[PDB]
Symmetry: D2
Subunit: 238 residues, 4 copies
């Protein structure tokens, strides 16, 4: 049985044969690579970008924003009730790919908070983590595929040479080690927010393929055939 | 020279003559007592209730949920860009009233978090406070009208007798002492979250008038003529 | 090789044989059951207690306080550099035992925060979790020995019958699932704090054996021979 | 009539005639400019520094660490019960002065957390603010003397010219707007943590005079005659 995925994609490469708009874009992916909602993303290759993501079960609106120093931001939102989509326990992560074309998929920092409140006025259960650099052997991350942490304390989701040159046909992901509780039968409100900073560099005219923040079943793994345009998340483009 | 008001009301008394639905309701108030959105509130007089309020500038949805132990919740939301409504600096507060009819408007706890993030590398600016108990002399609150802290460590927004019985024609508010920064020219995303627990008791078969969490110009004060149905927030019913 | 243990013990049963003082006590344990520091704990069996523990690497003072509603608190401290003791990556946990004599070792809530500041700017890393009730399937806990979560949402560290009657000769522990990063080469300051609430009930005249909060090597497991007076932490009394 | 002051000073200029050690030093000040504890400061004029300060009422140890890019660290600690020094309600702030000699007293960020926990089931009361830039009109700061926010979003505690050259005989302070509750009779534990980053530059061979983080009576003001060596904090050198 396939994983169940919700993701925010920073999609650098337009794959118009599988429903991408014809420009780099941000998107909200609900169980499919074909985003439920997109916005045109004005990439700044070579510059550090920031992504902020948030949701809560009352508003039922998942939103993301991407910005760079000085520049205008790109936003995207989608109305969705995540408890109709995801299981009650999840893992959260980051993924990235390259394909025929390539780019660095470098993460410089990543934080995440979730809260789960029940009517029983026990206060909310909560989880927060923050990484402002990464350990070169990160015991609180599950690294999958080609993901690794370099000597600069950067998380490299996809392969780069010793010179820092990105490689094609690469896929990797990093999940936080602890499962996250995002609903239960008695729950009143669940919320989460996530931030990460990133550095996509590329020598290619058309960099590819992009980076995501994603939420999945706890035992999620890189699907077979999920390289390139599928962002290490899906086994097909349905 | 009137205040600028955004509020979530727990309106226990139907004033159908000024547009209330004909039942106790939770509502979102944008510069008018006449709610832009309401939902039926199934009151549990004598039982401790919990309200959670959330907003962010990307999703632009103001949401609130009210619940009691072992009971279903009631939610209300309204799509609104708060930057088009409120000033950049605000104060946040709780208000309550009684009129001809009455209830205790007792607050057992109140917390609030705000974050403001700009395009810069700088992490979000933030404020958080949490009161799970109120001090006899709460120097971090601006107490307005009949509002006072009692011997049990509770905030009473409106008058109660020496034996704990509510009095009619009362108005009271409590503002957090520090102004909150909610937008800036340079801003990328702003968000706030708030929670309070409340205890409404009444000897009246129909209690009145309600409690709000509100946001306003920093110099906000109880308007003249704001008693009873106007919840201590508005000078008229327009 | 043997685990590395730093613990705060709530030691309900005096084993004067192995150096316990002749009264219930709160103790700080560094690599030995024989506490580096103790203070008398005036137990209130059948009443909900609270423990707060804190440390930072500049002050180098590990402190704990135990209290009950309307009671005098008891404090214990020890001056130690915890990096002389602990590995850079640890798991944090709660343990309990019963032996010949018994008690319930019930956990009603548990929170923990750690922060590590280096050379990057704001926290190289932070981790916080808060459990105000425990799920029936707590996927973010590693439960060892007899530890289980019950129908009331409490964490029971040691065995209880269907009636809630504690059992003798029981051992149980619960670890937070994710490893915690408490030091690295570039580190300037590291800190943590933890809080738990507990309900110890017993039909025995002298309840036994107690509860700890502990920090260990990530791969920590209940040592052979760690029953009773050794609190599920140590293979012997050295 | 005189303020009540607790401070951590970064004293760039040795005033031996008022009991400074004869080198730049960090110190802990309890109701006097004459530090109760000092450490030689591994000082790096022209480089951005970071300060971390912490205290809790159980350990009763006020500790500070100053470092630069995670290196050149200086630490100072002092054993003191702040309950016996400070009032229950305070304001927290930053101060800085120049005198005959001069330096920029630039603050690039400032954060603060306080927690106060009593016997009750009630969880901690708390306050947190984080400023990673300073806005043009900081309505949540009480700016005293020469302190202002500049075009870069930095807080300048003392006078700098239009070109960025520091001026002599300056004094400035910034207080967080909300009073902070650091103790109550029913308290079990109270704690606070403060961080700030700073940038001290000087065309002088000897910069002066220094920067402090301080905790005072809520109504604290710059004492008359508190320039230069007295750091904007004390009326005299007693
Ligand atoms: O990295 C960009 C893309 O490269 C590959 O698709 C192609 C894009 N342009 C091409 C041109 C020729 C050939 Br053959 C291929 Cl496979 C492609 C595939 O790996 C895609 O999944 C990926 O999105
Ligand atoms: O507390 C409930 C209500 O009591 C008063 O309104 C009346 C309720 N019943 C009435 C009957 C007659 C007249 Br006149 C009035 Cl104003 C009222 C007014 O104080 C209202 O503002 C308030 O909402
Ligand atoms: O639970 C209380 C204690 O019970 C046992 O030790 C004894 C305490 N009193 C005794 C009396 C007789 C014998 Br045999 C034993 Cl083992 C004990 C052992 O299980 C101890 O580890 C434990 O601390
Ligand atoms: O900025 C450094 C110092 O400059 C002044 O003190 C003097 C330093 N050298 C002097 C020489 C003569 C005289 Br009079 C004075 Cl006050 C001083 C005073 O402003 C001091 O408070 C300050 O610490
Ligand atoms: Ca694509
Ligand atoms: Ca009404
Ligand atoms: Ca013992
Ligand atoms: Ca000096
Ligand atoms: Mn796409
Ligand atoms: Mn947000
Ligand atoms: Mn209404
Ligand atoms: Mn919330
Ligand atoms: Mn012991
Ligand atoms: Mn603490
Ligand atoms: Mn000095
Ligand atoms: Mn700290």
């Amino acid at each position: 049985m396939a994983d169940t995925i919700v993701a925010v994609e920073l999609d650098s490469y337009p794959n118009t044969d599988i429903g991408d708009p014809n420009y780099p874009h941000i998107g909200i992916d609900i169980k499919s690579i074909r985003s439920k909602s997109t916005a045109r993303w004005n990439m700044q290759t070579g510059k550090v970008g920031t992504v902020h993501i948030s949701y809560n079960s009352v508003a039922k609106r998942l939103s993301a924003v991407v910005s760079y120093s000085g520049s205008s931001s790109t936003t995207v939102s989608y109305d969705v009730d995540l408890n109709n989509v995801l299981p009650e326990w999840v893992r959260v992560g980051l993924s990235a790919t390259t394909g025929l074309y390539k780019e660095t998929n470098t993460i410089l920092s990543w934080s995440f908070t979730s809260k789960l409140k029940t009517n029983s006025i026990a206060d909310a259960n909560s989880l927060h983590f923050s990484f402002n650099q990464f350990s070169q052997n990160p015991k609180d991350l599950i690294l999958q595929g080609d993901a690794f942490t370099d000597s600069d304390g950067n998380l490299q989701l996809t392969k780069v040479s010793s010179s820092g040159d990105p490689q094609g046909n690469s896929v990797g992901r990093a999940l936080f080690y602890a499962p996250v509780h995002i609903w239960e039968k008695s729950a009143v409100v669940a919320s989460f927010d996530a931030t990460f900073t990133f550095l996509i560099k590329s020598p290619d005219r058309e960099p590819a393929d992009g980076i995501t923040f994603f939420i999945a079943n706890t035992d999620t793994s890189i699907p077979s055939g999920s390289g390139g345009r599928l962002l290490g998340l899906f086994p097909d483009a349905n």
